[PDB]
């Protein structure tokens, strides 16, 4: 598909169509403050091309939005390279949300989840987040319809044990939460339970093939999931390999090269030698 940059969508739905061809959002996705929107505005709205967000997903005050199952049906990975106060997923004051419905969400690399103050929000207790986040310790899921004993959650689905009891796991009435065998780890699997290639992230279109991932556990280059960017390529945005020229083009109106990475700024003890974008250490104290 396409790589789009981090987006900030407010007030009107008009700007939302900027995501239409998008596959990876390199940066964050914030959709917020839509006070005049109604359910009808979302009945026909879908971005099935979105597979991954490199930073974080934030939904706040978006009126008329009842589920995300149609909006982001194929979002599989949120990498959490940059987070919104320790969170890679924020669902806050989503007056009208009845369920999450992100049935393709397999992994949150990095972050934690904050789902707070959602009157109407159910299908939360049906989610085993331990399959999605390494650390659920820091999850802050409070003040939702779910807290007040009367969610009519209904799921065939695989059950998992979180407290002392086994509970069936699903996203909506019609979508189970996919659970891959223990041995697949984070790589994902096919319907038949066959593990995806070890360089894949949440799922694959074919098993045992690093060119057929729908994610990349490590880095992406020329179709394939690779463990590392080989030289002459540089690690970029913690998910893709680029050449020096790309990093240079960006810099020229402030990306720099350091430790085989194309980075926003030089780290501590270093300053930027102008002709080659390379971070070089400071002779005496650092000018800044």
């Amino acid at each position, epitope marked *: 598909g396409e790589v789009c940059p981090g987006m900030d969508i407010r007030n009107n739905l008009t700007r939302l169509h900027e995501l239409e061809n998008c596959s990876v959002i390199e940066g964050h996705l914030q959709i917020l403050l839509m006070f005049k929107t109604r359910p009808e505005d979302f009945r026909d709205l879908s971005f099935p091309k979105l597979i991954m967000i490199t930073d974080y997903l934030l939904l706040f005050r978006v009126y008329g939005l009842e589920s995300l199952k149609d909006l982001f049906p194929n979002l599989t990975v949120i990498r959490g390279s940059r987070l919104f106060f320790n969170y890679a997923l924020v669902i806050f004051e989503m007056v009208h949300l009845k369920e999450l419905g992100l049935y393709n969400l397999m992994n949150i690399t990095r972050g934690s989840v904050r789902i707070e103050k959602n009157n109407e929000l159910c299908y939360l207790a049906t989610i085993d987040w331990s399959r999605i986040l390494d650390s659920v310790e820091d999850n802050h899921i409070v003040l939702n319809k779910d807290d007040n004993e009367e969610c009519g959650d209904i799921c065939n689905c695989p059950a998992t044990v979180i407290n002392g009891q086994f509970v069936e796991r699903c996203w909506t009435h019609s979508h189970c939460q996919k659970v891959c065998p223990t041995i697949c780890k984070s790589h994902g699997c096919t319907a038949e339970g066959l593990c995806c290639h070890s360089e894949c992230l949440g799922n694959c279109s074919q098993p045992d093939d*690093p060119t057929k991932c729908v994610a990349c556990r490590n*880095f992406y*280059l020329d*179709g394939r999931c690779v463990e590392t960017c080989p*030289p002459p390529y540089y690690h970029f945005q913690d998910w893709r*390999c680029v050449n020096f020229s790309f990093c240079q083009d960006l810099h020229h109106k402030q990306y720099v090269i350091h430790n085989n990475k194309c980075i926003p700024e030089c780290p501590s003890g270093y300053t930027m030698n102008s002709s080659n974008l390379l971070c070089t250490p400071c002779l005496g104290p650092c000018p800044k």
Partner: antibody
Amino acid sequence: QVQLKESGPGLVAPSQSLSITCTVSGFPLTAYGVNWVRQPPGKGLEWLGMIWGDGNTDYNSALKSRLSISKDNSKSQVFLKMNSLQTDDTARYYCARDPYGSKPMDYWGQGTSVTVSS
Amino acid sequence: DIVMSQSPSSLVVSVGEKVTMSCKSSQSLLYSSNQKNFLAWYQQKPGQSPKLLIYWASTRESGVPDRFTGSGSGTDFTLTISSVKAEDLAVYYCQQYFRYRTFGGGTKLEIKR
């Protein structure tokens, strides 16, 4: 199903060119690199060059423009061309896959023997 | 250009014994960004094509017996064969894949019988 096979001319007259086609299958040339390695009888392995997924080229410094590596992604073919061969270019020529970012040369062709004489 | 050099040119051992051969690169092959060494070891049985055994100087390829143990870092490397088996007879090569790719002169393994 990863396979590589070299189609060589077998015999090259001194001062003439060498053209070898490496026909690959089971993977896309768009996502993987292909190298060429030669082995003179009873001698070691010599790395000749590679072609990356993006068509970028790498050649052994010794090959002062005598070596050309090109490819046709749609036909899963990699082309080696070497100008003005001499007797010391008598060797077995192999094309080998390269999963560059992730692995070193995995999957070697059986090789094609090249003899330079008139 | 990166130059690779191996020793011995050849070695002989009987079945059951452990074997060690060495490699040297003119430049460091240890990648900063992940702390991995960009070196590989191949085994070539006579009459056959060479086979990948070890990459990242220590990572064993799938289908490779635990007998083969890759070692070393920076510019100097070694390949070890824990308990030589009859069919371990072959020429062993080191390859750098840090910048371009270059093979060492290789080392020949003979079996004492």
